[PDB]
Amino acid sequence: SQSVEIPGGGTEGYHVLRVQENSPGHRAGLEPFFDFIVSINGSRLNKDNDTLKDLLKANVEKPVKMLIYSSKTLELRETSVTPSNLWGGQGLLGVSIRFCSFDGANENVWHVLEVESNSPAALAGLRPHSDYIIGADTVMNESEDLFSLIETHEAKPLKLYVYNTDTDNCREVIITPNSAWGGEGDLGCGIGYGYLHRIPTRPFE
Ligand SMILES: [K+]
Predict the structure, then answer these.
(1) CA angle, 29 as apex, 164 and 11 as ends, to 5°?
(2) Which of 58, 89, 97, 118 could form a disulfide bond with 14, CB atoms 3.0-4.6 angstroms apart?
């Protein structure tokens, strides 16, 4: 429970799924997958409503303070964002968000271990040790969920989003499970899960 305390309480906020290039969101340093918008100018975003939308519009072209919780670092931070209509893309922030809880979010990751040569994993470009699977086309909330998807994608392309500790960013991976492949399992990579196999929490010193 030794979790950073959230000003205004609770564990819900706005999960950043996507950040458009050169958006106000990108300039403020929002990272997809890991960041939850917790508050804006001190107003706690603990309800799925229009307060964020409305406070951005009110402050168009002006800077605004945001509190952000990261499921990567497990820390809160404050950042400045300037909502804008003048950058070419869609939205004042340029982000897609889903209102949900960040509680336990840092547990939902599957660490890529060794990757056997020429396996479905290698063909997809999964990288040993440095890659962590963190999402898919559907939500993945339980240890089993990655494997449920693998099992139902026998001989089918399965999209995964993967974080890499060398690049410190996430990328789309297409893998095709193949139980006939003639090395171990369906993937031909080991997968680590749980306390010792979460994202390293200090990408920067
Ligand atoms: K096999």
Answers:
(1) 85
(2) 97
CATH number, span 108-205: 2.30.42.10
Query: Do the two domains 1-107 and 108-205 of this chain adopt the same fold?
Result: yes
Beta strand extents in the chain (DSSP E only): 12-19, 35-40, 43-44, 64-70, 76-81, 95-101, 110-115, 131-136, 158-164, 169-175, 189-192
Closest CA to 144 of 100, 113, 107: 107
What whole-number distance in Å separates Cα of residue 76 and Cα of residue 74? Answer: 7
**Domain locations in the chain as residue ranges:** 1-107, 108-205
Q: From CA 167, how far away is CA 83, in angstroms rounded?
A: 27
Backbone angles phi, psi at 185, to 5 degrees: 65, -155
Q: Enter the tokens of residue 189.
A: 């990579």
Strand-by-strand arrangement of the 169-175 sheet: 169-175, 158-164, 131-136, 110-115, 189-192
Centre of ligand 1 from the C-alpha of residue 184, in Å: 5
CA distance 111 to 127: 10
CA 188–ligand 1 middle distance (angstroms): 7
- CATH architecture classification, 1-107: Roll (2.30)
- Report the distance separating Cα 59 and Cα 112, nearest Å: 43
Amino acid symbol at 130? S
